[PDB]
XYZ file of C-alpha atoms in Angstrom:
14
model
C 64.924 113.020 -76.847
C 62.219 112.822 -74.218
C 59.819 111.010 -76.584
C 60.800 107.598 -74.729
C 60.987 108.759 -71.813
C 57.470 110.057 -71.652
C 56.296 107.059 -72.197
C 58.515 105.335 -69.670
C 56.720 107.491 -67.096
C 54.008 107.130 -69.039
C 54.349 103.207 -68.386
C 54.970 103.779 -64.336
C 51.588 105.448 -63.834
C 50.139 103.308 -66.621
């Protein structure tokens, strides 16, 4: 799922 991942990108601009 992308769930994760969101918030992987989410951590590089955060």
């Amino acid at each position: 799922k992308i769930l994760k991942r969101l918030a992987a990108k989410i951590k590089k601009i955060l």
